[PDB]
Amino acid sequence: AEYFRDEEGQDVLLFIDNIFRFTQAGSEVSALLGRIPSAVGYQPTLATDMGLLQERITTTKKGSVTSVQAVYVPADDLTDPAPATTFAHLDATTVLSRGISELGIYPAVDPLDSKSRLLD
Amino acid sequence: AAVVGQEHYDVASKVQETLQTYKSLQDIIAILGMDELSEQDKLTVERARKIQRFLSQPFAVAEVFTGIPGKLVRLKDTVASFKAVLEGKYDNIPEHAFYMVGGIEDVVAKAEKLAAEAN
Amino acid sequence: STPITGKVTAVIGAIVDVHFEQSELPAILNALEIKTPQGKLVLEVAQHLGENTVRTIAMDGTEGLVRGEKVLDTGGPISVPVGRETLGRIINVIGEPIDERGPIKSKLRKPIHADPPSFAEQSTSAEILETGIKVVDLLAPYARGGKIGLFGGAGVGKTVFIQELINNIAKAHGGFSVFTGVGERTREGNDLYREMKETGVINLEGESKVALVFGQMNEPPGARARVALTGLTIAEYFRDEEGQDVLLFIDNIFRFTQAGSEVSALLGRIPSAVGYQPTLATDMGLLQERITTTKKGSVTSVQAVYVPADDLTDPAPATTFAHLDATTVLSRGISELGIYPAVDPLDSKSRLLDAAVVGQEHYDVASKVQETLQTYKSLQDIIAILGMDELSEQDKLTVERARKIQRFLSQPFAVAEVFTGIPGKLVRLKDTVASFKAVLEGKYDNIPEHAFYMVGGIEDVVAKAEKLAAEAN
Amino acid sequence: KAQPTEVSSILEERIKGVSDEANLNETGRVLAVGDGIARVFGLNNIQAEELVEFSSGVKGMALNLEPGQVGIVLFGSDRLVKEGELVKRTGNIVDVPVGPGLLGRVVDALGNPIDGKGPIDAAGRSRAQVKAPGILPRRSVHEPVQTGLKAVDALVPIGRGQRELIIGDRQTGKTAVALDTILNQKRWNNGSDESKKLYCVYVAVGQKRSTVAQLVQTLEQHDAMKYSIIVAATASEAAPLQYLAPFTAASIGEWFRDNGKHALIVYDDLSKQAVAYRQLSLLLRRPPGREAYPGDVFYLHSRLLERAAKLSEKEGSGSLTALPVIETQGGDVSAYIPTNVISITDGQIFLEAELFYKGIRPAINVGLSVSRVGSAAQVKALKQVAGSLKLFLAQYREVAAFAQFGSDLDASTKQTLVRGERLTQLLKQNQYSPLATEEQVPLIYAGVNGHLDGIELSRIGEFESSFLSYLKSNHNELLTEIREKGELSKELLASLKSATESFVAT
Amino acid sequence: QTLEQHDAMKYSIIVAATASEAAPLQYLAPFTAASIGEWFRDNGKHALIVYDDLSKQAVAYRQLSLLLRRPPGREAYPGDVFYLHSRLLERAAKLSEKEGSGSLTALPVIETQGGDVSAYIPTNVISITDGQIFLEAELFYKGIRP
Amino acid sequence: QTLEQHDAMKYSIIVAATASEAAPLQYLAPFTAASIGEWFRDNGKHALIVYDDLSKQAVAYRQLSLLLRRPPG
Amino acid sequence: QGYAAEISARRNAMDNASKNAGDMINRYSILYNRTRQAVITNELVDIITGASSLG
Ligand SMILES: Nc1ncnc2c1ncn2[C@@H]1O[C@H](COP(=O)(O)OP(=O)(O)OP(=O)(O)O)[C@@H](O)[C@H]1O
């Protein structure tokens, strides 16, 4: 994505799915590299690693980058720090909810919690 | 059904259905009371609370706690007893007479005892 | 003379490792100094790692420590200046004043990790401490040398309540006050100091009646885990030497439990259940059991409680409440009716509201008062619903009597003479019991309700009754 | 005068005599003291749980041994034990003075008396870690422990050798039951027969100094201190003292158990002993279990409470009966600690906070408080005239939530409701007035057979003292009959019914 | 850009230490800006400082003292993290007329989780500061803004 | 015996690492039956496999990682 | 008259509803507090457990 951004000068779509596997694969070895495991069970290098993956995907003045990152949440529990760090890093967060898929209406966009930034 | 007989299996399934209905309706009973049910489900709750107090059995070893001698009720009388209470043959008996009893014969007898006492 | 000089080998946050040369080691809980360009930096030895090497917790900021600096020893524990010269002087946990009124010319310097008094000296019948505020000495009396849980957030007159306690103990029993803010907000520390100047309990020229110990929030946690002990030792010297009954004020004991949590989590000890330190009961006991009554004198403690997340199975209030003799709630719904003080009557319950200690008459009067306000509270809904026609003569008199009592609980303050201008009435106990008894009988039912607000005793009740009779005609 | 200096100089001769034979095959340096525990190098011939003495007077127990060093837990504040000091070993597994000379004294966990009444006239030393008596020298319980409370001996009786639990909440009247039982044993401690006396050992752990001071003052007002033994482990003192003190008091109890006499012990309260044990196991890196009590905290209360039963005739028919006290959190019976004391003791007296909030003191919840081998050892009279009372309070508890609807009902529920309210108001009791079984029988007898039903509800509290003084002035022979026989025959029953209906008629 | 379009950049000092940067920058950026505020405080002026937020700052301090092998406490935060924030927020004050009546006023921000004040960092900051402007999503969806 | 009643033994392969046996059998036996299934898969047939039940395998894998002194997650 | 009878019995039913709701809130607050304390302890255990099995 960065090479099509800078050295090309072009609109770049980036459909990453999934991003939680990145931090989870941080967790699956950060126990074994001799790090003291942090809160709920994720690594200590969470905000910095989610930072370095959520900062190189951005729209520079050399090219336009539109990112769509599907993000897993464990057990529908948004107070988990592994998706809750991602809340600060996104502009349009469509929050799905299993409690709307229980009513059969698809797609189960929770029409309250899906705020955004361009609703000026 | 192929192990204990079809009748036994059907009686056990009906008893667990009635008690599951009670445990599901537990919360609305706790909040408002028994008066805010339907008229099939209110009969279901009442028969469920019959069957709960009927599940009690005076043990031959816990004789000093309850003051009642022991009750060794065989299987077939228990099957017929629960089949009888499920089929609705006894729906007007007061609930307390089901409590701490042997078989349905002793349910009739103890309801007669409390009938002769309360009068 | 013969110094015990070693080198700092390790600085970890608020933990400091000090190496000593051989056959010299002070034991646990001994004060160590480090000279800085800014002043002195005190350490308290808490763990011996062997190897002639000790491990301490900080008592001030540990920036800039070159490892290898000389470590001077003072042998004993953290010394504090005590006595008469300490009054009106804001002493931190080190022992130095911070009000910039020069050094404190005190006569002795006492250790703070002393022994609690032995079992033969514990006073075997807890009498009632006559505080002076009416609702305290009527409903939930403070145990003489006991422990008192003062709940409620700020802004309900809690500092007014505690200055009123200061003045009334200064008058009635003549005892002095030692206030101690463990974890005290610095800004309201200064506001408390200014207000204690202007109310007269601190005279910068005469004889002040209080010693302030403010362990600020920006000190490392080893400070806050000893600030209460500093205030405790200043209480103990006034107790066992000059023989008085001294009031030790501690705000706020939950921040002391936090100080315990963070000290014994910085030391690498395994944390307990919820996350408070596993030395919870013992390091609450070493603060509680030094506040008691001997045959010489007594120290009675008023200590606040921040109930965490409004929950009372959390072990820090569930450990403080295994020690508190009497609670006192300054609620919202009582100052909202404009009542000074806001001692809520139904909630503040004592373990010494008992007829075998306070006497039969006091217990009878207090029990009828509690049932009267209980019936009043249980009627307060249908008073708004149905009105005063559903009351029988069994009931409408109880509503009238309970309004009379509820107005009668308020008291003109010895400190609200610049607030309200009404001079304070120090009410004795033998006036208080008789006054509430006479109102519970019915001998003053003809007296209107308005003449019971902010009155001292039954005599000023009669005087205000005559004055409002004169102003109405 | 100089008479204690004479005695102390004789003790100087003992110390100087001990100095002539002092060769301590043991001493080792204190490598490191940390986490409130000491590591000691040397001592190559020490035992597991052997008592040692540091060079500042703080004793210690050596609870673990490793190749290289020995780990000794302290018995006080670690302010005294300094690095690099000298560690003599005493030579003993952890023992305490036992024997009859402790009656009247107030000791802490190691037999050091702190009353100020001289040294302990000690009839011997005994281990703290005694194996419990096996299943063969046991007899099932058959003798009453008359607590003197009305509701306890009505509903939940206590046998000599029956470990009963007093569980409850904070400031809800837990200690008062044990204190009233100790004051009720004055009926026989003044007497002459040994097998009816009942010595009380009250073991205060984790409590304040001044509370134990007031409790000693209370047990000397009502004169219990000719048979009391106070073992105090107050919360100022450090954690392994509290870990030890109920065990040493159980050794005190076993001394009375093996020697034929009968003795009651009161642990109060073991929910602070498990606090001290989780402190000692979270300072030695042993990993916590459920709710951070360490994984063997079931075993601790096990090995404590199992040193109390009824010995049979083969060992001398002595006994030891325990009342541990458990402070729960807000009416809970399902934390990890109160579901381990319940799974040891033979029943509960669940002192629920809500009933004390309505002033009904003591606040025994009847429908929860039960005892398992109580019924085989009640006094015969109460068992004759209260065989309905448990079932009747169960009946009244059935219609507890049914009458809150305010609905008009039949006659039988109104009759049972009035009799149940009279019985609930009837079982109240003031502090320090235990009623002997000779007076517990007629009050319950007036409660059972409908005689109270004409009385208003407020008069019942003075009905108690009025009917008691009516029987004390006039029908004194009936009280002597209940005292001697302990059983109501038919003639006794008819005379009692006449004596009721007399005073019931006015 | 928003402070440009309304021209508050005349008097604004932004200290950004964003999530691209490493953990000690996030640990130091409130203290750096605290000294920047104290320069105004010692010079008789009025400086409104606004931290935003302090949750991430504590997350970086957690990453430091968990990778630095200091032992953790409740929710794996370090021990003295209260001593972190109590050393920060108390740098704001109101000086006397003897010193020059300078003043620093602190508005920190705590991103809580799922409508909670029982978490460890918000409990600590509420125990420090002078109250809440407690904001909620439930009142936001009624349209009550702010 | 049930699969012999309704006669499905012609096409059944039971791989039963029961709780009598040691912990790495409970760690390993699903992968062994996975190879057994892949033999049918790499020859154009069709195989249905049923592992039952994976929480026991997670228990055994927890046991293997704890006893070999790895820091658990 | 049946209208006033309905509204009186309905008022009594809502009174019993408010009282039972208050009581079962006084149960679920105790369950809430025990769940919170057990959760904080049962995650602090598995934070600490990693910090002892190091190299
Ligand atoms: N029968 C009674 N008469 C008068 N007061 C009583 C009675 N029973 C209990 N109390 C009151 O209960 C209060 C506490 O008693 P007790 O010590 O038994 O409670 P507790 O929960 O055991 O307290 P702690 O657990 O701190 O020992 C006392 O103040 C006492 O006045």
PDB file of C-alpha atoms in Angstrom, chain C residues 236-390:
ATOM      1  CA  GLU C 236       0.918   9.731  71.808  1.00  0.00           C
ATOM      2  CA  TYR C 237       3.269  12.305  73.282  1.00  0.00           C
ATOM      3  CA  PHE C 238       0.328  14.467  74.280  1.00  0.00           C
ATOM      4  CA  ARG C 239      -1.369  11.410  75.734  1.00  0.00           C
ATOM      5  CA  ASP C 240       1.194   9.619  77.823  1.00  0.00           C
ATOM      6  CA  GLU C 241       3.243  12.628  78.930  1.00  0.00           C
ATOM      7  CA  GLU C 242       0.978  15.546  79.748  1.00  0.00           C
ATOM      8  CA  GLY C 243      -2.069  13.379  80.448  1.00  0.00           C
ATOM      9  CA  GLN C 244      -4.935  14.690  78.350  1.00  0.00           C
ATOM     10  CA  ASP C 245      -7.688  13.438  76.035  1.00  0.00           C
ATOM     11  CA  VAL C 246      -6.455  14.267  72.566  1.00  0.00           C
ATOM     12  CA  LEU C 247      -8.390  14.210  69.290  1.00  0.00           C
ATOM     13  CA  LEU C 248      -6.512  12.662  66.381  1.00  0.00           C
ATOM     14  CA  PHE C 249      -8.122  13.574  63.069  1.00  0.00           C
ATOM     15  CA  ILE C 250      -7.197  11.456  60.069  1.00  0.00           C
ATOM     16  CA  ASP C 251      -8.316  12.197  56.537  1.00  0.00           C
ATOM     17  CA  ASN C 252      -8.563   9.989  54.642  1.00  0.00           C
ATOM     18  CA  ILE C 253      -7.936   6.428  55.782  1.00  0.00           C
ATOM     19  CA  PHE C 254      -8.635   4.874  52.392  1.00  0.00           C
ATOM     20  CA  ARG C 255      -5.721   6.825  50.963  1.00  0.00           C
ATOM     21  CA  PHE C 256      -3.661   5.310  53.756  1.00  0.00           C
ATOM     22  CA  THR C 257      -4.800   1.901  52.550  1.00  0.00           C
ATOM     23  CA  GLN C 258      -3.724   2.909  49.030  1.00  0.00           C
ATOM     24  CA  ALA C 259      -0.333   3.868  50.450  1.00  0.00           C
ATOM     25  CA  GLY C 260      -0.103   0.409  51.958  1.00  0.00           C
ATOM     26  CA  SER C 261      -1.083  -1.155  48.624  1.00  0.00           C
ATOM     27  CA  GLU C 262       1.526   0.674  46.642  1.00  0.00           C
ATOM     28  CA  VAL C 263       4.342   0.275  49.162  1.00  0.00           C
ATOM     29  CA  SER C 264       3.799  -3.451  49.421  1.00  0.00           C
ATOM     30  CA  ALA C 265       3.380  -3.760  45.690  1.00  0.00           C
ATOM     31  CA  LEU C 266       6.579  -1.856  44.966  1.00  0.00           C
ATOM     32  CA  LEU C 267       8.435  -4.235  47.241  1.00  0.00           C
ATOM     33  CA  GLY C 268       7.557  -7.178  45.033  1.00  0.00           C
ATOM     34  CA  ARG C 269       5.345  -8.944  47.548  1.00  0.00           C
ATOM     35  CA  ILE C 270       2.524 -10.830  45.880  1.00  0.00           C
ATOM     36  CA  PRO C 271      -0.746  -8.881  45.942  1.00  0.00           C
ATOM     37  CA  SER C 272      -3.730 -10.339  47.796  1.00  0.00           C
ATOM     38  CA  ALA C 273      -7.369 -10.401  46.918  1.00  0.00           C
ATOM     39  CA  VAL C 274      -8.838  -7.383  45.417  1.00  0.00           C
ATOM     40  CA  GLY C 275      -5.418  -5.738  45.075  1.00  0.00           C
ATOM     41  CA  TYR C 276      -4.785  -4.305  48.466  1.00  0.00           C
ATOM     42  CA  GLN C 277      -1.587  -5.485  50.052  1.00  0.00           C
ATOM     43  CA  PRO C 278      -1.511  -8.849  51.862  1.00  0.00           C
ATOM     44  CA  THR C 279      -0.377  -7.104  55.052  1.00  0.00           C
ATOM     45  CA  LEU C 280      -3.779  -5.436  55.251  1.00  0.00           C
ATOM     46  CA  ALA C 281      -4.997  -6.501  58.688  1.00  0.00           C
ATOM     47  CA  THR C 282      -1.631  -6.071  60.389  1.00  0.00           C
ATOM     48  CA  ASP C 283      -0.811  -2.709  58.825  1.00  0.00           C
ATOM     49  CA  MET C 284      -4.223  -1.491  59.750  1.00  0.00           C
ATOM     50  CA  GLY C 285      -3.767  -2.794  63.279  1.00  0.00           C
ATOM     51  CA  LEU C 286      -0.458  -1.008  63.764  1.00  0.00           C
ATOM     52  CA  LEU C 287      -2.393   2.186  63.144  1.00  0.00           C
ATOM     53  CA  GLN C 288      -5.541   1.276  65.064  1.00  0.00           C
ATOM     54  CA  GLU C 289      -4.239  -0.280  68.266  1.00  0.00           C
ATOM     55  CA  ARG C 290      -2.065   2.678  69.101  1.00  0.00           C
ATOM     56  CA  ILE C 291      -5.239   4.772  69.375  1.00  0.00           C
ATOM     57  CA  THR C 292      -6.693   3.649  72.687  1.00  0.00           C
ATOM     58  CA  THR C 293      -7.211   4.570  76.333  1.00  0.00           C
ATOM     59  CA  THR C 294      -4.676   3.948  79.056  1.00  0.00           C
ATOM     60  CA  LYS C 295      -4.914   4.814  82.730  1.00  0.00           C
ATOM     61  CA  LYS C 296      -3.014   8.054  82.099  1.00  0.00           C
ATOM     62  CA  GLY C 297      -5.094   9.573  79.315  1.00  0.00           C
ATOM     63  CA  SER C 298      -6.616   8.823  75.947  1.00  0.00           C
ATOM     64  CA  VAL C 299      -6.540   9.661  72.258  1.00  0.00           C
ATOM     65  CA  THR C 300      -9.877   9.573  70.456  1.00  0.00           C
ATOM     66  CA  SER C 301      -9.692   9.426  66.665  1.00  0.00           C
ATOM     67  CA  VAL C 302     -12.048  10.905  64.110  1.00  0.00           C
ATOM     68  CA  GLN C 303     -11.053   9.409  60.785  1.00  0.00           C
ATOM     69  CA  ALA C 304     -12.857   9.721  57.483  1.00  0.00           C
ATOM     70  CA  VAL C 305     -13.625   6.893  55.040  1.00  0.00           C
ATOM     71  CA  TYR C 306     -13.804   7.105  51.270  1.00  0.00           C
ATOM     72  CA  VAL C 307     -16.047   4.143  50.500  1.00  0.00           C
ATOM     73  CA  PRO C 308     -14.689   2.752  47.205  1.00  0.00           C
ATOM     74  CA  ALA C 309     -17.273   2.692  44.377  1.00  0.00           C
ATOM     75  CA  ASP C 310     -20.084   2.880  46.996  1.00  0.00           C
ATOM     76  CA  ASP C 311     -19.521  -0.665  48.169  1.00  0.00           C
ATOM     77  CA  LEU C 312     -19.046  -2.164  51.619  1.00  0.00           C
ATOM     78  CA  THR C 313     -17.642  -5.627  50.981  1.00  0.00           C
ATOM     79  CA  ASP C 314     -14.432  -4.218  49.530  1.00  0.00           C
ATOM     80  CA  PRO C 315     -11.776  -5.137  52.136  1.00  0.00           C
ATOM     81  CA  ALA C 316     -10.589  -1.627  52.910  1.00  0.00           C
ATOM     82  CA  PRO C 317     -13.896  -0.413  54.399  1.00  0.00           C
ATOM     83  CA  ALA C 318     -14.522  -4.005  55.464  1.00  0.00           C
ATOM     84  CA  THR C 319     -11.305  -3.832  57.483  1.00  0.00           C
ATOM     85  CA  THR C 320     -11.790  -0.324  58.839  1.00  0.00           C
ATOM     86  CA  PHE C 321     -15.294  -1.340  59.961  1.00  0.00           C
ATOM     87  CA  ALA C 322     -13.854  -4.075  62.140  1.00  0.00           C
ATOM     88  CA  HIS C 323     -12.309  -1.280  64.197  1.00  0.00           C
ATOM     89  CA  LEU C 324     -14.704   1.686  64.208  1.00  0.00           C
ATOM     90  CA  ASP C 325     -16.676   2.176  67.404  1.00  0.00           C
ATOM     91  CA  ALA C 326     -19.072   4.787  66.086  1.00  0.00           C
ATOM     92  CA  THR C 327     -20.067   6.136  62.695  1.00  0.00           C
ATOM     93  CA  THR C 328     -21.227   9.658  61.860  1.00  0.00           C
ATOM     94  CA  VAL C 329     -22.723  10.428  58.457  1.00  0.00           C
ATOM     95  CA  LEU C 330     -22.806  13.952  57.046  1.00  0.00           C
ATOM     96  CA  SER C 331     -25.425  13.338  54.401  1.00  0.00           C
ATOM     97  CA  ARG C 332     -26.715  15.519  51.581  1.00  0.00           C
ATOM     98  CA  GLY C 333     -30.433  15.441  52.392  1.00  0.00           C
ATOM     99  CA  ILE C 334     -29.897  17.074  55.792  1.00  0.00           C
ATOM    100  CA  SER C 335     -27.818  20.078  54.787  1.00  0.00           C
ATOM    101  CA  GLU C 336     -30.265  20.443  51.896  1.00  0.00           C
ATOM    102  CA  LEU C 337     -32.870  21.298  54.544  1.00  0.00           C
ATOM    103  CA  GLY C 338     -30.418  23.926  55.823  1.00  0.00           C
ATOM    104  CA  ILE C 339     -29.418  22.128  59.027  1.00  0.00           C
ATOM    105  CA  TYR C 340     -26.059  22.777  60.702  1.00  0.00           C
ATOM    106  CA  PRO C 341     -24.534  20.279  61.395  1.00  0.00           C
ATOM    107  CA  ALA C 342     -25.897  17.672  58.993  1.00  0.00           C
ATOM    108  CA  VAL C 343     -25.584  14.699  61.349  1.00  0.00           C
ATOM    109  CA  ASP C 344     -28.116  12.311  59.879  1.00  0.00           C
ATOM    110  CA  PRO C 345     -29.903  10.615  62.778  1.00  0.00           C
ATOM    111  CA  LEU C 346     -31.080   7.323  61.329  1.00  0.00           C
ATOM    112  CA  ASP C 347     -27.691   6.284  59.951  1.00  0.00           C
ATOM    113  CA  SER C 348     -25.043   7.310  62.476  1.00  0.00           C
ATOM    114  CA  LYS C 349     -25.128   4.329  64.816  1.00  0.00           C
ATOM    115  CA  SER C 350     -22.768   3.553  67.668  1.00  0.00           C
ATOM    116  CA  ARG C 351     -21.630   0.395  69.342  1.00  0.00           C
ATOM    117  CA  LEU C 352     -21.753   2.436  72.555  1.00  0.00           C
ATOM    118  CA  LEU C 353     -25.403   3.397  72.338  1.00  0.00           C
ATOM    119  CA  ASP C 354     -26.098   0.914  75.090  1.00  0.00           C
ATOM    120  CA  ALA C 355     -27.749   1.225  78.486  1.00  0.00           C
ATOM    121  CA  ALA C 356     -24.971  -0.642  80.292  1.00  0.00           C
ATOM    122  CA  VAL C 357     -22.538   2.212  79.505  1.00  0.00           C
ATOM    123  CA  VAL C 358     -24.441   5.450  78.863  1.00  0.00           C
ATOM    124  CA  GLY C 359     -27.005   4.732  81.574  1.00  0.00           C
ATOM    125  CA  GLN C 360     -30.646   3.779  81.326  1.00  0.00           C
ATOM    126  CA  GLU C 361     -32.096   7.276  80.876  1.00  0.00           C
ATOM    127  CA  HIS C 362     -29.801   8.205  77.992  1.00  0.00           C
ATOM    128  CA  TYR C 363     -30.512   4.931  76.203  1.00  0.00           C
ATOM    129  CA  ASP C 364     -34.271   5.307  76.660  1.00  0.00           C
ATOM    130  CA  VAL C 365     -34.248   8.871  75.297  1.00  0.00           C
ATOM    131  CA  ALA C 366     -32.080   7.928  72.322  1.00  0.00           C
ATOM    132  CA  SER C 367     -34.192   4.861  71.497  1.00  0.00           C
ATOM    133  CA  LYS C 368     -37.398   6.890  71.492  1.00  0.00           C
ATOM    134  CA  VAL C 369     -35.679   9.525  69.314  1.00  0.00           C
ATOM    135  CA  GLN C 370     -34.589   6.899  66.783  1.00  0.00           C
ATOM    136  CA  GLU C 371     -38.054   5.356  66.652  1.00  0.00           C
ATOM    137  CA  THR C 372     -39.619   8.828  66.399  1.00  0.00           C
ATOM    138  CA  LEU C 373     -37.520   9.847  63.408  1.00  0.00           C
ATOM    139  CA  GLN C 374     -38.000   6.331  62.002  1.00  0.00           C
ATOM    140  CA  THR C 375     -41.785   6.710  62.108  1.00  0.00           C
ATOM    141  CA  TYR C 376     -41.396  10.217  60.691  1.00  0.00           C
ATOM    142  CA  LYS C 377     -39.398   8.885  57.741  1.00  0.00           C
ATOM    143  CA  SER C 378     -41.899   6.081  57.181  1.00  0.00           C
ATOM    144  CA  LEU C 379     -44.722   8.637  57.204  1.00  0.00           C
ATOM    145  CA  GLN C 380     -43.010  11.230  54.925  1.00  0.00           C
ATOM    146  CA  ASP C 381     -44.455   9.673  51.753  1.00  0.00           C
ATOM    147  CA  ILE C 382     -48.100   9.561  52.827  1.00  0.00           C
ATOM    148  CA  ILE C 383     -47.703  13.024  54.354  1.00  0.00           C
ATOM    149  CA  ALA C 384     -47.362  14.237  50.772  1.00  0.00           C
ATOM    150  CA  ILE C 385     -49.922  11.731  49.460  1.00  0.00           C
ATOM    151  CA  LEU C 386     -52.838  11.947  51.889  1.00  0.00           C
ATOM    152  CA  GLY C 387     -52.235  15.020  54.056  1.00  0.00           C
ATOM    153  CA  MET C 388     -52.586  15.486  57.801  1.00  0.00           C
ATOM    154  CA  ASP C 389     -56.178  14.186  57.952  1.00  0.00           C
ATOM    155  CA  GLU C 390     -55.224  10.492  57.865  1.00  0.00           C
TER     156      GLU C 390
END
